[PDB]
Amino acid sequence: SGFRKMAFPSGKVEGCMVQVTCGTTTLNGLWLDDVVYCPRHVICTSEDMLNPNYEDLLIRKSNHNFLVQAGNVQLRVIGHSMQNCVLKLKVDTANPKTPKYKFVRIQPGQTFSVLACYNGSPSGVYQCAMRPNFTIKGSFLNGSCGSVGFNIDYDCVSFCYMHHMELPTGVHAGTDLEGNFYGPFVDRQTAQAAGTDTTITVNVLAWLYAAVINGDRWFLNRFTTTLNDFNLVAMKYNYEPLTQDHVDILGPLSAQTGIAVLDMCASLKELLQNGMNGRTILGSALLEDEFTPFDVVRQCSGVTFQ
Amino acid sequence: SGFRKMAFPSGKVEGCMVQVTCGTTTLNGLWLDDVVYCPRHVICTSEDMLNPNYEDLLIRKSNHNFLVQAGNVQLRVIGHSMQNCVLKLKVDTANPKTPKYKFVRIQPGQTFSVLACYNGSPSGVYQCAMRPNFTIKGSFLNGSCGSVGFNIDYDCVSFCYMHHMELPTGVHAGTDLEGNFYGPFVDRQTAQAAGTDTTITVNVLAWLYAAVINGDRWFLNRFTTTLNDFNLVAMKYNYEPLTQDHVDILGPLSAQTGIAVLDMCASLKELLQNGMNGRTILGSALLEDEFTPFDVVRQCSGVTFQ
């Protein structure tokens, strides 16, 4: 019993974190096989960040200008290539600790673990969601750029996020591992707007189901509702709309608990309009949206990873 | 910027988790050098748990009755020994991935990371505190006993907790790695009372300091107070009393923020008596006590671990 945010075990990623140093700029890189992936703004100085011409900046750099260090060993850069916002630094040694990996572009509302690193060394791991506005509310200090987000599908590490920027609003922005930013952000020190963030409704519902599995039942109400009625209330509170695909995803949770998705939706609706109201759910005084339905099933069923 | 619970990177512990199987009972074990540590109640069946004579039960077992598996390899038990509530299973192979480690008995209010395991395989990692009543509010399903709690002092893993029991109240109980339970609990399927839990005041104060470092300043008040006055209010709300040692621990936070510990205490006192009150701190609607002053400094300063 019990419920915790729970990050994926980080070991397979820890052996892939490296330090990249360009011209006195140093951040983290991801060493997979013979390639180190890192934010292309490694090549930037504080002044360049204000208005960088990355192509012009990169042309003034050569393989020898990149100092990739892994513990007490240094990799030799034999090649460098810019894919969107990622620098692909081809090094001479394939990472012996390279796990079975995949690059995935996740969707807003999915969760993943972040391995926060500094100077290529791991400091901590935490679980977070991609907000609907494609930002993440992480914990990133100077030099943590290039820290990566990941999921683990048993034996396979799915890298889904590389940290690039802290926006002046203190939220974090980054790319997939192909260097395509999540959201409309660019790697420049300029004011950039993130959209209105919304709460991830399907995640809240999965968490309510977690609460039911773990004994918190006070919010189950005596009312019901339809999808169209619920979405009308959800839109008012900045909750993402619920689709039939969301209902179908919650099916297993509904079957385990005997509570139909639409009945849970009516419980949520009440919580939205009338509050929690001194009371807590799974220890929380706020509705939690950083658990997907798969996270709940995973944690409630004990899914292991090789 | 930003603040997250943050667990320690788990890699060094992942390579120490093994599966122990006695008589169709299987839980997790900790493989350090040539010894596997696991809850002695591995030797128990569901019926034995109600009233086990561990000495009598263990005498009916022999080394050959213990099946320690690590992935697709099995260790051979050459020796077994009972230290308090821990079984020390001496195996034939020293764990090649044995990190520099220490066993520590932590104090109530300290935090540590838990690597939740099933069948000796890691499922997730999360950070938690030892409650003042020596329980932990974790997430543990059947078969997660023997999962371990740990801290990382740069290069050194400090094992501080092994999970043994879920109490009928759904909270979790366990031992240090010498098998001495935390709290007055025993490894028997019987109703056992945990004390009144209190909030860890020094941790709340460190978290308020985190909130100040990260921009949340609305709770700084226009009042002050003394230690004796504050503890009088804290006792009323089930907050642990503050000592001068607690003040001294918070010194660095006071120096970074320019806010004296006793002034932060006055802010806390107000929050206690008058509430938060629709408002949040670091995203939270409840006062958080699972960050120690060292956790805050660690996360605000970017401490790396080898």
Side-chain angles (χ1 to χ4, degrees):
Chain A
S1 193
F3 214 65
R4 281 295 189 149
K5 204 135 262 183
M6 280 236 325
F8 290 95
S10 49
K12 288 151 190 53
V13 185
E14 289 169 52
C16 304
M17 295 332 285
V18 295
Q19 153 195 84
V20 174
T21 278
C22 205
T24 81
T25 307
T26 284
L27 40 76
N28 316 292
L30 186 58
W31 189 12
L32 286 175
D33 298 316
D34 41 273
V35 172
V36 165
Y37 300 83
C38 67
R40 68 178 173 172
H41 78 80
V42 61
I43 76 196
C44 287
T45 66
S46 34
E47 34 275 68
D48 297 312
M49 276 306 314
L50 277 285
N51 214 346
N53 182 306
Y54 281 105
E55 306 261 45
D56 274 16
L57 270 160
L58 194 32
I59 299 172
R60 298 265 218 101
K61 309 320 270 213
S62 188
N63 313 302
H64 92 275
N65 293 115
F66 294 106
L67 280 304
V68 185
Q69 164 142 35
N72 49 281
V73 213
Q74 201 101 25
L75 284 315
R76 183 197 309 257
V77 180
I78 64 180
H80 61 269
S81 165
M82 179 139 78
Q83 188 192 358
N84 313 301
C85 301
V86 82
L87 244 218
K88 274 159 91 303
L89 294 177
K90 188 139 147 233
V91 285
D92 72 314
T93 303
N95 175 32
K97 316 247 208 153
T98 294
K100 176 143 190 293
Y101 74 92
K102 101 168 63 147
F103 288 172
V104 299
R105 177 150 185 97
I106 64 154
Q107 290 294 297
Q110 297 203 255
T111 57
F112 54 95
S113 285
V114 166
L115 181 63
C117 295
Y118 298 94
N119 310 110
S121 290
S123 68
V125 52
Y126 55 90
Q127 178 96 338
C128 63
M130 185 49 89
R131 305 304 313 167
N133 70 353
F134 294 95
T135 63
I136 86 171
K137 298 152 133 314
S139 171
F140 286 116
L141 304 167
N142 290 351
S144 68
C145 306
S147 290
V148 286
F150 63 97
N151 283 277
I152 302 181
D153 202 77
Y154 195 63
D155 76 306
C156 188
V157 183
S158 295
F159 290 105
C160 55
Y161 178 80
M162 173 180 272
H163 179 52
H164 278 249
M165 210 121 317
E166 185 175 283
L167 296 181
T169 38
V171 293
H172 304 100
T175 64
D176 56 31
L177 260 303
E178 299 208 87
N180 308 289
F181 252 91
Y182 283 99
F185 311 112
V186 287
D187 39 9
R188 184 183 161 216
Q189 204 186 305
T190 194
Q192 290 161 51
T196 312
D197 194 27
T198 50
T199 311
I200 306 127
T201 309
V202 57
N203 283 16
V204 179
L205 286 157
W207 178 73
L208 292 184
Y209 275 102
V212 173
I213 291 164
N214 287 281
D216 284 12
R217 284 169 208 121
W218 63 262
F219 53 89
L220 291 325
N221 68 343
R222 197 130 182 71
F223 311 71
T224 188
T225 206
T226 172
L227 216 60
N228 225 66
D229 216 273
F230 174 71
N231 286 351
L232 165 80
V233 168
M235 167 165 105
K236 169 158 208 313
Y237 292 99
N238 268 309
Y239 267 59
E240 64 143 37
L242 216 71
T243 64
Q244 187 49 51
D245 286 0
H246 294 151
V247 173
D248 293 345
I249 297 164
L250 288 159
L253 289 182
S254 160
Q256 190 167 2
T257 64
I259 304 163
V261 182
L262 253 68
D263 279 48
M264 197 66 84
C265 289
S267 295
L268 180 47
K269 169 198 307 223
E270 196 101 341
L271 293 172
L272 289 190
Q273 301 162 319
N274 315 109
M276 252 130 132
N277 246 356
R279 202 41 290 166
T280 62
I281 302 178
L282 288 182
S284 184
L286 300 169
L287 292 170
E288 180 67 72
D289 71 340
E290 303 233 325
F291 293 98
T292 70
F294 295 96
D295 300 338
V296 174
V297 164
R298 164 180 7 247
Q299 188 169 162
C300 291
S301 303
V303 188
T304 36
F305 309 107
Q306 144 171 65
Chain B
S1 193
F3 214 65
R4 281 295 189 149
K5 204 135 262 183
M6 280 236 325
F8 290 95
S10 49
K12 288 151 190 53
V13 185
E14 289 169 52
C16 304
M17 295 332 285
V18 295
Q19 153 195 84
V20 174
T21 278
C22 205
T24 81
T25 307
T26 284
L27 40 76
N28 316 292
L30 186 58
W31 189 12
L32 286 175
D33 298 316
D34 41 273
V35 172
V36 165
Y37 300 83
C38 67
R40 68 178 173 172
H41 78 80
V42 61
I43 76 196
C44 287
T45 66
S46 34
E47 34 275 68
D48 297 312
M49 276 306 314
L50 277 285
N51 214 346
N53 182 306
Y54 281 105
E55 306 261 45
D56 274 16
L57 270 160
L58 194 32
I59 299 172
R60 298 265 218 101
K61 309 320 270 213
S62 188
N63 313 302
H64 92 275
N65 293 115
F66 294 106
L67 280 304
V68 185
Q69 164 142 35
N72 49 281
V73 213
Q74 201 101 25
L75 284 315
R76 183 197 309 257
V77 180
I78 64 180
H80 61 269
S81 165
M82 179 139 78
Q83 188 192 358
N84 313 301
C85 301
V86 82
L87 244 218
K88 274 159 91 303
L89 294 177
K90 188 139 147 233
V91 285
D92 72 314
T93 303
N95 175 32
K97 316 247 208 153
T98 294
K100 176 143 190 293
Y101 74 92
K102 101 168 63 147
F103 288 172
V104 299
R105 177 150 185 97
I106 64 154
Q107 290 294 297
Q110 297 203 255
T111 57
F112 54 95
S113 285
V114 166
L115 181 63
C117 295
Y118 298 94
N119 310 110
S121 290
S123 68
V125 52
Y126 55 90
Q127 178 96 338
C128 63
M130 185 49 89
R131 305 304 313 167
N133 70 353
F134 294 95
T135 63
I136 86 171
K137 298 152 133 314
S139 171
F140 286 116
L141 304 167
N142 290 351
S144 68
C145 306
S147 290
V148 286
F150 63 97
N151 283 277
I152 302 181
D153 202 77
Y154 195 63
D155 76 306
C156 188
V157 183
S158 295
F159 290 105
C160 55
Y161 178 80
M162 173 180 272
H163 179 52
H164 278 249
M165 210 121 317
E166 185 175 283
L167 296 181
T169 38
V171 293
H172 304 100
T175 64
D176 56 31
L177 260 303
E178 299 208 87
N180 308 289
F181 252 91
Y182 283 99
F185 311 112
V186 287
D187 39 9
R188 184 183 161 216
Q189 204 186 305
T190 194
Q192 290 161 51
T196 312
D197 194 27
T198 50
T199 311
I200 306 127
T201 309
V202 57
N203 283 16
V204 179
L205 286 157
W207 178 73
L208 292 184
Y209 275 102
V212 173
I213 291 164
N214 287 281
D216 284 12
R217 284 169 208 121
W218 63 262
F219 53 89
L220 291 325
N221 68 343
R222 197 130 182 71
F223 311 71
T224 188
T225 206
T226 172
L227 216 60
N228 225 66
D229 216 273
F230 174 71
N231 286 351
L232 165 80
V233 168
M235 167 165 105
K236 169 158 208 313
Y237 292 99
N238 268 309
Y239 267 59
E240 64 143 37
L242 216 71
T243 64
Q244 187 49 51
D245 286 0
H246 294 151
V247 173
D248 293 345
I249 297 164
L250 288 159
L253 289 182
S254 160
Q256 190 167 2
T257 64
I259 304 163
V261 182
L262 253 68
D263 279 48
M264 197 66 84
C265 289
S267 295
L268 180 47
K269 169 198 307 223
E270 196 101 341
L271 293 172
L272 289 190
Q273 301 162 319
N274 315 109
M276 252 130 132
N277 246 356
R279 202 41 290 166
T280 62
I281 302 178
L282 288 182
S284 184
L286 300 169
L287 292 170
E288 180 67 72
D289 71 340
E290 303 233 325
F291 293 98
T292 70
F294 295 96
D295 300 338
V296 174
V297 164
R298 164 180 7 247
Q299 188 169 162
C300 291
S301 303
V303 188
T304 36
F305 309 107
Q306 144 171 65

